[model samples]
Target: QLIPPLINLLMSIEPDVIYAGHDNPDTSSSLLTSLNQLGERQLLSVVKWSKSLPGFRNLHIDDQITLIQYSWMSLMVFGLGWRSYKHVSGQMLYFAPDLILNEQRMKESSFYSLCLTMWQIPQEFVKLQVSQEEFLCMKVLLLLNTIPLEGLRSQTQFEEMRSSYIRELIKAIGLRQGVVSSSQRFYQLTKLLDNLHDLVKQLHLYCLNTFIQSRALSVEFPEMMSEVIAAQLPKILAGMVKPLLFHK
Candidate 1:
């Protein structure tokens, strides 16, 4: 999990030595790769080795959330700022009397933070009482919402990815949630989701159609990309609009 030996190397080095983003165009992957090698091997291996934890059955929900929060703070913020190790290490170590609990807390926090970051959601929103798999699914749904119309359209060009299938997925999730909620509230949420799906699908289809029909368009991506995004942007206004002629 996260390669190995991530946390210790992170603590040992000064933050200035780290290059925040390397050659990769994607910022998230660069960040993930760096943190994956920063910590102590023994400490990080807890995530890789532990499967059964009978002790967690007795802990309260707040404690559980706290545990998750600390780990996430460690991985994301600690990796981002080297100062975070001191902050997070202290919080987790002090939380419960047992070393096992502290370790459990750190591991769960790291897992939660990793998932939340991957899903593009705030860690505060993840409810541990919910199954982690379900939480991950919700996180995916949340991330898809962040994709702008144009980005999703571009993404669909890749045959290996499932971009075309997401509209239906959103509808299914929205509908399932609607069925379980109060009628009036459910209608509001589902109806808005319906509108959103329509908006994204329309944009995606428009881009795809333009891509399919015109050979000239294919050659001018450098120009067309700007044209597509900038076509709707308004120009500066200098003077008032002229009055309309009367229709006598």
Candidate 2:
């Protein structure tokens, strides 16, 4: 019942056309600046978008803030992968309409290897022909992917919301084919989601390192990026948060 309505909400809340405000990234410094800028923008958009998600507001305010803070990186990368799959056939990282990171650009970036790692998710999306609805449900699930080991104050409500989205994903999968195909596709997609945790762990380390050397590198992490890094990233990197896994 609410699953169909949830899809519509997801569609409606997608951020508007965001420009990375790129010129020509002649040097790695400028590239980092612009990329960090784009990330800050996307991060803000994620906060706003999450607030509007169905049942999101019902979570405790701490749960609401904590979930977004923990999962923003995953949400941003997943959204970027979706954009890459849809717009550039996963040939590049589509940072924004104005900022497309092709192979050459990725090679030139500060975090070249991670760029390639991130591209694989989009490539898999292209291979699977992942539908918009499936991506939508997957994204919400991503938000719920990580949490405090002790659980949220509104933990029951959080679990309910997470379970509903999982059901929505199953329903979306079933829309395409019979049970056998659906099960395999479900397995494949969930495996990809599991792989995402590892991917983002690499990302987390690289980001924390770069952020540590920002001043020396002449790279600037914007306001929220800096606070987010200093505030929660240490705990996450130190294994203070529990990542909810879908597979054994």
Candidate 3:
């Protein structure tokens, strides 16, 4: 059997090492450092794969940058949920076969409640067994969301792409599951975006709080993420970076 293109793309870009926490330092600083690196890699992986989409490269560079700036965090959340859903076992989310972060371990962290809250949705997503096709469509839909950024040159084109993708998504669902079932599945899949968006908002808050207190650990974000934070979040959070951008 041939592999799905999106699945193959994700597998090729996926991180080999865990980035959420470190084994070297015993303090919260270590975890924050690890998370920053993890976030950078996560953003890079999303941008690299976004460019692989069929019509994405044809968009103007400014539009491409704006779309990424507005939606990268959403993609980050979606990817995290998908990866966690695939690897989750009981209360543990596996980053690597040998590296697992269990609920109890999360309980010991600074953001215990936040971690637990974040963990639950992905587990539910796995339990729902959202189809690979649905997941792929959802990712594309997310990328196409034009949230009125500073430099988006063409909202009309973005909306056209979004509508086209939605029509295809609906057609794909109807073909696979019949017209009646398609409505319910479409609703469920679209609802996943709302849930993911809320969770990521909380994640941003947690990150902001963490970064503010540990100002020393406020290292630079990868270029895409730095731009995203600057555009999406308050200046205080985006201003914490040390001027790093991952262009390669």
Candidate 4:
């Protein structure tokens, strides 16, 4: 597919953006803040690069922003898990060459056990040896999604586009894995989306809690980071940040 280069560009690890060790005394908060900034940077890149994809720019500007904002954390989780699948293989989770974390270290981070739980399915996805084309196609499917995102003027148009990509994805997989395996993979891919949506909800709550806690301690969250999380969780901004809450 013409998407290989863009996929490679997105997936290639840039050292400067990677969260290496920090000099701050509170390593836990520093780590959380660093990861938050890293995710924000990656999501912005997702928005920028996605616009370059075929037919994406044809969508309304509001739709483009809505899709990206709605799915930013899902895409971030997918990318991080893809790069850090070693976490499931009984090794450290590696966000970058310099930012690797063992299980105990992950536990001490802001999300605590939730962070490790998020990695489980993506590791399974990696084990399937999903290719760059497959990954990018799935991302396009995600970007074209309009069902959950409110206030989109082009839902029908985007849904049509999403359906077309779904067929394209099936063909892409069928060519690589034959009919039966392709069907199985397609089913698995759909399940991954459901799982990703649920996981991202959990993650958003964890981030809201962490952001609130950090503010209480007089720590500063990057403005961009706060903006990103706030976009997804508007209710959190409606009132004083309450005691940590999560939807079941």
Candidate 5:
């Protein structure tokens, strides 16, 4: 009763499928290079796409920047989950159309163990059959999932904005009323996102190490990623930022 289909919301605001922009990326170094390129493009999209994500820009400028930096990794991986889910039914890690990573590819990339944590999301998506409507809205929720432990400058607005996205997600789930009428599936899905924090933590741990070794290993972190990761990753690892959750 509050609003209508985000079917328009879905189509009106989105980006095109980005290519990995690499040809025959065969070596581990080459694979990392492709991922680096892919992430730079993806991160750029997240920053620009985030402003159009309905309620985000209204946030205090400091808080808006903070939230985006804090949550970019989760948002990126959440997206990777969906693309993987849709493309191969979660068979492999699809970094992009050109850079689909299987176990062998994941192994070569030096994050094979880390890749399993990444894989968990699409497997969950496959089980849930998360719809486009739901994914479109849920990524906002995921973007806004983490914040400073103390709070944001626009704390009240931030909470409301997060709750607003929750409402949208609920509405999205309701549209799939064809699936089942039970709210418990809602419970499962919300719980699912809440549960993702651990996976994200592991990812950040490995990623921060990667960043630390970036120069020595000859791996590249994009300028934007370098700035954002240097700013937030340490604090997040140190427990300065708190994840918003539906469950204890």
Candidate 6:
């Protein structure tokens, strides 16, 4: 079995801050935190490509996600991130609440499914030992965290335990073989990183716009526990994927 958690892997790459959706925490913030680990790995993979690119070090990922999503729509898509009721042009939209009620709703699934894809990078990596999965991990992590938040967690056990797990994961990533060991590979890596950085930023803006354009916010909403559940989710994706991808 693997040790520590994915966040630790991220820290090793010198990420500016670890964004969890607690403070100013909204649904988008919470889901992003859970999925950030994989996003980071994917992002790092891209960074591996671009790490040697001229002026590469000057890029800021967070702002890109925020801004790119605007093209497709508004930042109010965060309402979907928060599980609030919404309406568009006086037409009642019950996406969040309906998602909670309906067992097979795509709304919840789409978000979480993307999250699943985001989370799957480590497992794919451990099993396949490929650059693609690694790239996905970092992208997903950054995509999620870029959303704003409300606050931090209250559970000490989850915090300390998860922290330890992430530490070990970071250690493994640091020891792994990447595609960017030389200038040639670094050139390719940078191109890929630049593409991903821009792609995710587009996705963020797209989701935001789709969500806001769909409707207005609702009065009733689910509690914060949903995000908490999201936060406390296991690091299984990280452990399994990492080992499989880099089993050398």
Report the lDDT tens digits of candidate 6 across residue range 163-189: 443333234444453534533333433
Off by over 4 Å in 6: 1-13, 21-54, 57-107, 130-206, 218-248
lDDT of 3 by residue, 15-39 (tens): 4554553454234455445556677
How well does candidate 4 match the true structure in TM-score terms?
Answer: 0.77
lDDT of 5 by residue, 59-81 (tens): 89899899889888888899899
Evaluate residue 180 in candidate 6 and report its C-alpha lDDT on the 0 to 100 scale: 49
lDDT per model vs. reference: 0.28, 0.88, 0.60, 0.61, 0.83, 0.31
- Who is ahead in lDDT, 2 or 3? 2
The segments of candidate 5 whose C-alpha lies over 4 angstroms from its true place after superposition are: 1-3, 108-110, 178-181
Model 3 misplaced regions, further than 4 Å = 1-26, 95-99, 108-110, 149-151, 216-224, 235-248
lDDT of 4 at 164: 67
**lDDT (tens digit, per residue) of candidate 1 on 73-177:** 123221222122223432232111111112333234443443333221222222111222222222222222332223323333322222322333333334334
State, as a TM-score between 0 and 1, how close model 3 is to the true structure: 0.75
Q: How does model 1 score by TM-score? A: 0.21
* TM-score comparison, 1 vs 5, better candidate: 5
Model 2's alpha-carbon lDDT is: 0.88
lDDT of 2 by residue, 98-191 (tens): 8888877755544788898888889899999999989999999999999898999999999999999999889878777477899999998888
On TM-score, the candidate that comes out on top is 2
TM-score of candidate 5 to 2 decimals:
0.93
Clash numbers, per candidate: 9, 0, 1, 0, 0, 56
Error of 5 at 152 (Å): 0.8
lDDT of 1 at 104: 35
* lDDT at position 62, candidate 6: 39
RMSD of 6: 17.1
Best lDDT among the predictions, by candidate number: 2
